[PDB]
CSV table of C-alpha atoms in Angstrom, one decimal:
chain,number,residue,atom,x,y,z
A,3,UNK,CA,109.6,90.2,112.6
A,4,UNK,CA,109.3,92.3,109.2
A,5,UNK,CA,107.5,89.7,106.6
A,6,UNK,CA,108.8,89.8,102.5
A,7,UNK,CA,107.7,88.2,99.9
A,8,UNK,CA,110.0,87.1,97.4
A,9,UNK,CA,108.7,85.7,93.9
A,10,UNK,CA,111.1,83.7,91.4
A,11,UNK,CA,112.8,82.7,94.4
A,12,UNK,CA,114.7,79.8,93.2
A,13,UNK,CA,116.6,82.5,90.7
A,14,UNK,CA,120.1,83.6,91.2
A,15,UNK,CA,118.3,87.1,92.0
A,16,UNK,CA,115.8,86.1,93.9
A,17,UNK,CA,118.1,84.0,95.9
A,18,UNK,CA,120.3,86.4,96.4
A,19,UNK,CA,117.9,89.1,97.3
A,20,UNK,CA,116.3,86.2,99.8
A,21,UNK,CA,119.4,86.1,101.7
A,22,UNK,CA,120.0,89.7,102.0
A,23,UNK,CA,116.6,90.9,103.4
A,24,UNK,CA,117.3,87.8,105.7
A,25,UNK,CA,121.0,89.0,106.4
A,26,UNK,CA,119.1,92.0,107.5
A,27,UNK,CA,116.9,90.1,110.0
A,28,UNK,CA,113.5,90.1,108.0
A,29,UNK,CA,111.4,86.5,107.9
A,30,UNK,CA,110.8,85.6,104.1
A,31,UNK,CA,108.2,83.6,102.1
A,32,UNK,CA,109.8,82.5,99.2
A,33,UNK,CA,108.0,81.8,96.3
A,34,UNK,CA,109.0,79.9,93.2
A,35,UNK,CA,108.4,77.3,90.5
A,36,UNK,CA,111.2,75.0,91.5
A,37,UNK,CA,111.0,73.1,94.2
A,38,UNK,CA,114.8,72.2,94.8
A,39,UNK,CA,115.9,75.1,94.5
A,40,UNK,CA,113.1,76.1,97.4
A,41,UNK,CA,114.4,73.4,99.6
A,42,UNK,CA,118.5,74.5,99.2
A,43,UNK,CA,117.2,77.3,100.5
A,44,UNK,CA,115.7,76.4,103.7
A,45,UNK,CA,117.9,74.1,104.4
A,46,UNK,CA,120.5,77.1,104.3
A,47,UNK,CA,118.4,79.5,105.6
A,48,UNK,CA,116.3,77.6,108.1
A,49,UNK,CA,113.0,79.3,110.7
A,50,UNK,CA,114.0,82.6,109.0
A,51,UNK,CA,112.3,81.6,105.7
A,52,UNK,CA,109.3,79.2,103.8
A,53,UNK,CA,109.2,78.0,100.4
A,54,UNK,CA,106.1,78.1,99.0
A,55,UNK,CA,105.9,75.9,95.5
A,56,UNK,CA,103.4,78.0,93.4
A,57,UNK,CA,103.0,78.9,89.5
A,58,UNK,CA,102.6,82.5,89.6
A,59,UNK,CA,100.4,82.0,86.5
A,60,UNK,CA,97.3,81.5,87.2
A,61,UNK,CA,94.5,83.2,89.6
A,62,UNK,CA,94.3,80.3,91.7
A,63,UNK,CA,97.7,79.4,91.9
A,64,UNK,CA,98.6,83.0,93.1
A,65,UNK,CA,95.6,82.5,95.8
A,66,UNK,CA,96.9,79.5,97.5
A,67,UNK,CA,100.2,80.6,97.6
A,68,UNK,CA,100.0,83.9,98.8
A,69,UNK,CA,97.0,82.6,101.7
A,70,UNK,CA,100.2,80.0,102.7
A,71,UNK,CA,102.4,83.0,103.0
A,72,UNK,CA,100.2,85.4,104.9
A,73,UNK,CA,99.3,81.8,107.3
A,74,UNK,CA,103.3,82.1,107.8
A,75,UNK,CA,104.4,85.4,108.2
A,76,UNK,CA,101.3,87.8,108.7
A,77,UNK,CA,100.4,90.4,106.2
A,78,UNK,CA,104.3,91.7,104.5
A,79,UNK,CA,105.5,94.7,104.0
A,80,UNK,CA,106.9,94.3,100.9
A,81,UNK,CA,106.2,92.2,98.1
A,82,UNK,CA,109.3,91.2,95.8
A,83,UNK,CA,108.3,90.3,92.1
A,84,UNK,CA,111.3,89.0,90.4
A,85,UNK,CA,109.3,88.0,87.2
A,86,UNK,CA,113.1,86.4,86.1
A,87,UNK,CA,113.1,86.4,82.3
A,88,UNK,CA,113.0,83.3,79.6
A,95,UNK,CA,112.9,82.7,64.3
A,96,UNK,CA,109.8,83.2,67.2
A,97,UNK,CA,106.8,80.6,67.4
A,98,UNK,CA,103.7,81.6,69.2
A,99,UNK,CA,104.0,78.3,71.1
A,100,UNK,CA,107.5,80.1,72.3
A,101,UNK,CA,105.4,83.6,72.6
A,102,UNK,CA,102.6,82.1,75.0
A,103,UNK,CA,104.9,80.9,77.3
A,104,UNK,CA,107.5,83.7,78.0
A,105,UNK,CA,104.5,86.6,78.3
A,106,UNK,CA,102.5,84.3,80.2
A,107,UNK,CA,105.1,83.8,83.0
A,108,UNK,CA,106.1,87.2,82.9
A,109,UNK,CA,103.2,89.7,82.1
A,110,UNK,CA,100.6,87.3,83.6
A,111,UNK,CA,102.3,86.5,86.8
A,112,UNK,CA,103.6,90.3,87.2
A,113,UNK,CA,99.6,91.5,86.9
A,114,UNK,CA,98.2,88.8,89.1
A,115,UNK,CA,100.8,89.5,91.8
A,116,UNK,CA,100.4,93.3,91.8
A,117,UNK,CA,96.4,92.4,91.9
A,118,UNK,CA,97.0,90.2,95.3
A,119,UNK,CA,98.9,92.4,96.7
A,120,UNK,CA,96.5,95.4,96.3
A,121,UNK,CA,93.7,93.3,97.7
A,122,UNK,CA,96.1,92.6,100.2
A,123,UNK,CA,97.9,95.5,101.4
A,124,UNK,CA,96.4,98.3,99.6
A,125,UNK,CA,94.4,99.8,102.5
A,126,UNK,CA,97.4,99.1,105.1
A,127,UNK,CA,100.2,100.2,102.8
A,128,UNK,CA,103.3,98.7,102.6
A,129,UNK,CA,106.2,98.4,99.3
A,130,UNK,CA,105.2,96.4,95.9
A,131,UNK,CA,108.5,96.0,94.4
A,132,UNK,CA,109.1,94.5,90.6
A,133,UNK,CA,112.0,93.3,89.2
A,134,UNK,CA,112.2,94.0,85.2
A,135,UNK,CA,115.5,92.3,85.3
A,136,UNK,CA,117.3,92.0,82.0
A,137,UNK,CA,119.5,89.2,81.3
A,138,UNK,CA,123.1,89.3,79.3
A,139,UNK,CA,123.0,88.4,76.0
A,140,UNK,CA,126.1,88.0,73.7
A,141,UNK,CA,124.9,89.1,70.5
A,142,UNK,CA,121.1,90.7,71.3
A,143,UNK,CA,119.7,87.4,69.5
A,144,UNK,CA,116.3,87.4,70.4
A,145,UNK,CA,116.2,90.8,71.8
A,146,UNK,CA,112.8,92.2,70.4
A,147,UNK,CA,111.0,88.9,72.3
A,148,UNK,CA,112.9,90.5,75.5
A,149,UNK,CA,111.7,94.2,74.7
A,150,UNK,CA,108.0,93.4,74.4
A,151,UNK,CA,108.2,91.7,77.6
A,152,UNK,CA,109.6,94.3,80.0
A,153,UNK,CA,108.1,97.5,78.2
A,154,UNK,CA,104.3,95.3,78.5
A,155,UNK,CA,105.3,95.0,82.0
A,156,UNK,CA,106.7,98.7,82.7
A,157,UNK,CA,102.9,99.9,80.9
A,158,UNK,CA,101.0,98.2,83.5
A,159,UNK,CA,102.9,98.7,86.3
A,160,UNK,CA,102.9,102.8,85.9
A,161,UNK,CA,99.7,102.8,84.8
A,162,UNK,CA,98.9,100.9,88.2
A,163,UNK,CA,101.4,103.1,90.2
A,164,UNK,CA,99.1,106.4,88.7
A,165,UNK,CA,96.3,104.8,90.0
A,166,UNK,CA,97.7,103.9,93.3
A,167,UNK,CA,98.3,107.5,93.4
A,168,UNK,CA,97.8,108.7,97.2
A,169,UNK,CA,97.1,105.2,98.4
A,170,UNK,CA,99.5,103.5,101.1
A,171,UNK,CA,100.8,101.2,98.6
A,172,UNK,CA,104.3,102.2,96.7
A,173,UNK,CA,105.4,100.9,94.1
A,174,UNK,CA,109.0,100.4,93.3
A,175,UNK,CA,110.5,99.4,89.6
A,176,UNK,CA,113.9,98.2,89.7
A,177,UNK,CA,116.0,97.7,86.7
A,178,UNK,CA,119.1,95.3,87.2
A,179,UNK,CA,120.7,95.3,82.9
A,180,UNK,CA,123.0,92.7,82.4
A,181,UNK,CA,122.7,89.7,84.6
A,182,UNK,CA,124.0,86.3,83.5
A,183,UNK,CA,122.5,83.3,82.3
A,184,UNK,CA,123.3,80.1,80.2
A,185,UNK,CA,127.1,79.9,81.0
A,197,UNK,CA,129.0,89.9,84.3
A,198,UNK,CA,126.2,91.8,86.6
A,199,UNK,CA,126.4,89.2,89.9
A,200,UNK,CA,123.0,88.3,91.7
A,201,UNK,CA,124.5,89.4,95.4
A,202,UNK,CA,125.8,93.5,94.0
A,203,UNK,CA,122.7,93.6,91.9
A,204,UNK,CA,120.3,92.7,95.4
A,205,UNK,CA,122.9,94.9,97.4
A,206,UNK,CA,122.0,98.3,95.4
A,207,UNK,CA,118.2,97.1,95.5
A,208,UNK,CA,118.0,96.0,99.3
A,209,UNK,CA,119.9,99.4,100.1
A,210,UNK,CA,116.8,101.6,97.4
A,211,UNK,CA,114.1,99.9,99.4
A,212,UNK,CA,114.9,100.8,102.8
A,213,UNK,CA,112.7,102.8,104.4
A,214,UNK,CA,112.9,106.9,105.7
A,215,UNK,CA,110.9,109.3,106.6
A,216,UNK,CA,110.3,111.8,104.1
A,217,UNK,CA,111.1,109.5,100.6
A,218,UNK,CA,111.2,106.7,98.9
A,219,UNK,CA,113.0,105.1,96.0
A,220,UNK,CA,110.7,104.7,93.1
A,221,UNK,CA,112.9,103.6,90.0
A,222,UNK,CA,116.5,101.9,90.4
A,223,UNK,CA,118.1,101.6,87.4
A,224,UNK,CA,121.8,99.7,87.7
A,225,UNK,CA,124.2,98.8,84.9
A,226,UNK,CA,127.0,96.4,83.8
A,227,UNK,CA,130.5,98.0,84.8
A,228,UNK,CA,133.0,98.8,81.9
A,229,UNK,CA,135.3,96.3,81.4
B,3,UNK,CA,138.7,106.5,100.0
B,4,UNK,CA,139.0,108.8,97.0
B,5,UNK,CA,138.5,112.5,96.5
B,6,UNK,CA,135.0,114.0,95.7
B,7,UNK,CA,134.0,117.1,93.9
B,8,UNK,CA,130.4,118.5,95.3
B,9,UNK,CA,128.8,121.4,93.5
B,10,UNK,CA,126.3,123.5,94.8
B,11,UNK,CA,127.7,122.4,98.0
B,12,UNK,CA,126.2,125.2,100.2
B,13,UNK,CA,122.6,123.8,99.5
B,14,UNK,CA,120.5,122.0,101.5
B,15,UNK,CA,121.1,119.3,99.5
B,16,UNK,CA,124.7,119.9,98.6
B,17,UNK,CA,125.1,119.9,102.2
B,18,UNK,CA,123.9,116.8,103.0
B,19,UNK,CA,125.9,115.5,100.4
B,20,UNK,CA,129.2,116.6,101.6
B,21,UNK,CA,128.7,115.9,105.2
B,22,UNK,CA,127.5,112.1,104.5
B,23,UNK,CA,130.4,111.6,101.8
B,24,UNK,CA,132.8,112.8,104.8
B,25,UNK,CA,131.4,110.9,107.1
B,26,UNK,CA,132.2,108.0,104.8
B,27,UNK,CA,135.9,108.8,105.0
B,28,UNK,CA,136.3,110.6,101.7
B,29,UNK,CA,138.0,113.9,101.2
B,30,UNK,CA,135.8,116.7,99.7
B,31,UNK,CA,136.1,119.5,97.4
B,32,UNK,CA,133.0,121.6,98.0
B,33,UNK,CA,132.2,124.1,95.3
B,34,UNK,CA,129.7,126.7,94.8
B,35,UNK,CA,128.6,130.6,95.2
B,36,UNK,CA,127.2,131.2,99.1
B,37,UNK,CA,130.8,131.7,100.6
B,38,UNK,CA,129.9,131.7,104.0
B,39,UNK,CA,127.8,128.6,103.9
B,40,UNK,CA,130.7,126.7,102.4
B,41,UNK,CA,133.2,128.7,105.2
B,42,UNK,CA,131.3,127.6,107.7
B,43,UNK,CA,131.1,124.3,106.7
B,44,UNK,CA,135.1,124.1,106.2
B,45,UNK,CA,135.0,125.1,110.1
B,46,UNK,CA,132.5,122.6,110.6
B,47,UNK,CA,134.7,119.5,108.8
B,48,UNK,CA,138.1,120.6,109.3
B,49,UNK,CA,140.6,118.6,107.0
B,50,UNK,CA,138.8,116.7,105.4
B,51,UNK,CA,136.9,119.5,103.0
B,52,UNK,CA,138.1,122.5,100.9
B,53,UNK,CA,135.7,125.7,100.2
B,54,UNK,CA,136.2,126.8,96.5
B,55,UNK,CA,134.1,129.5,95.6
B,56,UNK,CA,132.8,129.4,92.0
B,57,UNK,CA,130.1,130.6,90.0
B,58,UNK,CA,129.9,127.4,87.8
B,59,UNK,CA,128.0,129.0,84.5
B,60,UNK,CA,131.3,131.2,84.0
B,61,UNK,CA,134.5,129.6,82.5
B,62,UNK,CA,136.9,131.0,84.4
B,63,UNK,CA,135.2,130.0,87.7
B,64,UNK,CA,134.9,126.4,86.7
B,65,UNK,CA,138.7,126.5,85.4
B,66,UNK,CA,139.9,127.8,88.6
B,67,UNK,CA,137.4,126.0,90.7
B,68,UNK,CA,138.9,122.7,89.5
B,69,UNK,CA,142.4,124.0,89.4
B,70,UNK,CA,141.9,124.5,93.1
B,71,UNK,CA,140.3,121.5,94.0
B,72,UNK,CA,142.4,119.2,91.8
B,73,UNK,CA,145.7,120.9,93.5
B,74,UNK,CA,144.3,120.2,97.0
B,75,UNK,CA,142.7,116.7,96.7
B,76,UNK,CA,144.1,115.7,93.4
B,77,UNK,CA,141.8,114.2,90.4
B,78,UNK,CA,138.4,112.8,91.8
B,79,UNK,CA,137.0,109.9,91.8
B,80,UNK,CA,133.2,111.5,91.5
B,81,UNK,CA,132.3,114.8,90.1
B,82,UNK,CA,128.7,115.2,91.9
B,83,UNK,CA,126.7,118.2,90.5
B,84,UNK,CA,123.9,120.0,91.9
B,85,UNK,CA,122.2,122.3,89.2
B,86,UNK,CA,119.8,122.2,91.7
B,87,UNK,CA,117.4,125.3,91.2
B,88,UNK,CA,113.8,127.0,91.0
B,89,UNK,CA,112.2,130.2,90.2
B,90,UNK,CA,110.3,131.3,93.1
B,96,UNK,CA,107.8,134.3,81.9
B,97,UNK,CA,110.0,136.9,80.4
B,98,UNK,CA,112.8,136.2,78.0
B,99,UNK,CA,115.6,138.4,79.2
B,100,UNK,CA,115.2,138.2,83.1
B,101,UNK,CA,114.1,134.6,83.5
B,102,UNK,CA,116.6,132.9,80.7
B,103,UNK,CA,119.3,133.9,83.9
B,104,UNK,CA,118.6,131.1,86.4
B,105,UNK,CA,117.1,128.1,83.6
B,106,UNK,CA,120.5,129.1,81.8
B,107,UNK,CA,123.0,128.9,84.7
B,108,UNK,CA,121.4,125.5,84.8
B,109,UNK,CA,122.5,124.5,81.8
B,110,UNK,CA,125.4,126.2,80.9
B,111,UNK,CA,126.8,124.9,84.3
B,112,UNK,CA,125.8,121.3,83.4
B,113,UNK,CA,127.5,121.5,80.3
B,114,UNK,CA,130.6,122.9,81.6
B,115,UNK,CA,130.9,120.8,84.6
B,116,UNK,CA,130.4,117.8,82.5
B,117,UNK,CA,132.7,118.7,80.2
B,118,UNK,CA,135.8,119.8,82.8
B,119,UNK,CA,134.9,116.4,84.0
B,120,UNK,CA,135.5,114.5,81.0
B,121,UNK,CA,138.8,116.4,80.2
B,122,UNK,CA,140.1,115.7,83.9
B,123,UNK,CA,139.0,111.8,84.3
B,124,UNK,CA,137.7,110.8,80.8
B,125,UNK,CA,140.8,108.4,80.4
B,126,UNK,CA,141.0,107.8,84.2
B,127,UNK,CA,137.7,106.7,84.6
B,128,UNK,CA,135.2,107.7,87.5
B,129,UNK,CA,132.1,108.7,87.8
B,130,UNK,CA,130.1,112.1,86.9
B,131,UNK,CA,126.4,112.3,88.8
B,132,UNK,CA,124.1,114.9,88.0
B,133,UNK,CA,121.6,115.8,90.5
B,134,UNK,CA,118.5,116.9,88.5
B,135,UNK,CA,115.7,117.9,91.4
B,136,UNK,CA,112.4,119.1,91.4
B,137,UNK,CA,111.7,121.3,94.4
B,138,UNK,CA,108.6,120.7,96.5
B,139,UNK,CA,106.6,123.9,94.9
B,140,UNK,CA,103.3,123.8,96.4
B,141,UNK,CA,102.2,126.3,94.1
B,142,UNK,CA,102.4,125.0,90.4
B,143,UNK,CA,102.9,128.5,88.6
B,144,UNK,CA,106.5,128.0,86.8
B,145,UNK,CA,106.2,124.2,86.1
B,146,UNK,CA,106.3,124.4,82.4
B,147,UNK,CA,109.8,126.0,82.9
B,148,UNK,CA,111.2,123.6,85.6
B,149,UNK,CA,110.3,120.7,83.2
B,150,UNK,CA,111.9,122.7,79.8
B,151,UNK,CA,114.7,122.7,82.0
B,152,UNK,CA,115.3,119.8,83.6
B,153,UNK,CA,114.7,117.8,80.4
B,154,UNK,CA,117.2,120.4,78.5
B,155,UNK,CA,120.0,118.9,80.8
B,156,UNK,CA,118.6,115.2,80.9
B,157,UNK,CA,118.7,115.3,77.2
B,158,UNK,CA,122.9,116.8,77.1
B,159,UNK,CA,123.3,114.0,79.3
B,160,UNK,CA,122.0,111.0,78.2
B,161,UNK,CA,123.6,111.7,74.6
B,162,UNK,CA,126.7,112.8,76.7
B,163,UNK,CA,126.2,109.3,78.1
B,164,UNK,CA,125.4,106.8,75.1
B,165,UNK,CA,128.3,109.2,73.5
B,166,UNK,CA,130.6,108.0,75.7
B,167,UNK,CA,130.0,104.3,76.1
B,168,UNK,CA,133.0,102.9,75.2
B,169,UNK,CA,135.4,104.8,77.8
B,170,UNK,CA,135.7,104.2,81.6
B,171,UNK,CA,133.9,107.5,82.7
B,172,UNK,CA,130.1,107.0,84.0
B,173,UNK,CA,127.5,109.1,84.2
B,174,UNK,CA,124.6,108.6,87.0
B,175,UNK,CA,121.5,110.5,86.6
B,176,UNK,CA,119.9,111.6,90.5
B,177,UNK,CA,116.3,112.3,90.6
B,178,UNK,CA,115.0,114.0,94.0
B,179,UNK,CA,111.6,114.6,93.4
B,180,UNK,CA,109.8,116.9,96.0
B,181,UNK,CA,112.7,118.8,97.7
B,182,UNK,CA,112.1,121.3,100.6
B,183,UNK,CA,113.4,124.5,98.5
B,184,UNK,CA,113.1,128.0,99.0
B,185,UNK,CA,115.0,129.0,102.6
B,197,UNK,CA,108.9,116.9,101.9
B,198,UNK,CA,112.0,115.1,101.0
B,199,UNK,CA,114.5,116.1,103.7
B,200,UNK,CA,118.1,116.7,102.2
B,201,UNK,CA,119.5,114.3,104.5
B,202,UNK,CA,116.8,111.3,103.3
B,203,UNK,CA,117.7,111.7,100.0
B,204,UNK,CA,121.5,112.0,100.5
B,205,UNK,CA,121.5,108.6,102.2
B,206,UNK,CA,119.9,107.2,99.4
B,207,UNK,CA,122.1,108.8,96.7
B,208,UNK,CA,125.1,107.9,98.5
B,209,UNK,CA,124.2,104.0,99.0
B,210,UNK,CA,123.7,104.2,95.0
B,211,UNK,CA,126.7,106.2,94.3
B,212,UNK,CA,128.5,103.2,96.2
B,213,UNK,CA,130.8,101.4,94.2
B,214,UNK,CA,130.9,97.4,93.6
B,215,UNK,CA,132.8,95.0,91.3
B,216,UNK,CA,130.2,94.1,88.5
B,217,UNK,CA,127.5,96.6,88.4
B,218,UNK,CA,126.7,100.2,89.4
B,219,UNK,CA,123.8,102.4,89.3
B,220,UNK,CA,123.2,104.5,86.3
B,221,UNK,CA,119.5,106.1,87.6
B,222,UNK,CA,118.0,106.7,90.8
B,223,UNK,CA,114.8,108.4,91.2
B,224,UNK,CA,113.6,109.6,94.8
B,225,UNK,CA,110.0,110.6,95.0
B,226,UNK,CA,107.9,112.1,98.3
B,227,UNK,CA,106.4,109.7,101.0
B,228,UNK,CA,102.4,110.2,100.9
């Protein structure tokens, strides 16, 4: 009955998150740029989810997708934004901002339009990803901190309006060969449940000691 | 599972605290200065909690508080302080209250890291700002909650390498002087304080439902 979004679907976070809400009876429109990975999902998943194809990068794009989603599910209650992550080039520059600053503004835009007046949870993941080394951390830095200015700034504005936001901060999840997807969604799943009197606004969670 | 150590256990908050974590099946060491509120809590949880009274700014309370709970419930597996307090400036009256809260962050953090620094476990500070509805002593309340966030984030990154980890709590908007209910934000401290295999969380911040 209870309608999510969930964007970056098709990553190991967003999949896992998928799952969990489901796991906890809620119907999910997954969005995502990958289509297989959309598809693994329904098949596991089945009536209790859609995948919606969509590149969250541009304004029609986000349209279409989220029109599909609300045709699907109703208007949601929250809105998951896992915006995923990615010696510079500016050809290398364009494309990680643009799929991470870009789609993160013109999400948060929808979903004011959206849900604004009828409240409900916009929920971002800055999520940031394991490096051995901190090679091309700076890149990395830029990216979440760009994303972090607007997303306060919008949450000051959205100041006494029925719309939260929520900033959730998973440090040290894998990629290219220790934080797992499904204990990183646990902690988050368990911040955003609702109660009475509060709210979770910032979730902060870190790699264990070894 | 393991033994807890709650400060300011006779609080709202504190409270809260200690009933959910023995609810949860864990044993309890319950420290602070109201003696009946932690007595009559002992009568309300039977075995499973011990009432050590302490005034936790003063070094021979804090030895003998954790003397006593350490001999009852041996070495904990979370030290969770509740500084926890507010005013309702002069320099020689009003330094009493913004010290204690301080002085008994300092000296619970640093029992902590003597007992379990080794060991390993978990020290979470609760650093709340109460619901004022007035506004008058803000400038205070900020001085010094950011006093005892600053101890312990170098306390923190000072101790990176070694198996002890320090959690930051942020309940924003508290009842107080007698929004947030106690038992709202508990629930949502305790679901972070939760421990999993790869990842725990190292900040939560609670803020008031509009």
């Amino acid at each position: 009955l209870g309608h999510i979004i969930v964007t970056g679907a098709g990553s190991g976070l967003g999949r896992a998150l998928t799952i969990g809400l489901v796991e906890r009876g809620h119907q999910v429109s997954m969005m995502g740029r990958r289509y297989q990975r959309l598809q693994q999902q329904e098949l596991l998943l089945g009536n209790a989810v859609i995948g919606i194809v969509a590149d969250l990068a541009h304004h029609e794009d986000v349209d279409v997708a989220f029109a599909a989603a609300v045709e699907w599910g109703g208007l949601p209650e929250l809105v998951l934004h896992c915006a995923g992550t990615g010696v510079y080039t500016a050809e290398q520059i364009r494309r990680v901002m643009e799929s991470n600053l870009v789609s993160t503004i013109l999400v948060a835009q929808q979903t004011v339009r959206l849900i604004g007046e009828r409240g409900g949870v916009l929920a971002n993941v800055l999520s940031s990803a394991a490096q051995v080394g901190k090679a091309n951390e700076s890149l990395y830095c830029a990216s979440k901190w760009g994303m972090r200015g607007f997303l306060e700034s919008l949450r000051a504005e959205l100041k006494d309006s029925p719309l939260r936001l929520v900033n959730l901060y998973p440090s040290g999840i894998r990629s290219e060969f220790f934080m797992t997807p499904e204990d990183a969604a646990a902690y988050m799943l368990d911040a955003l449940e609702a109660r009475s009197s509060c709210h979770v606004t910032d979730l902060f969670i870190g790699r264990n000691e070894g």
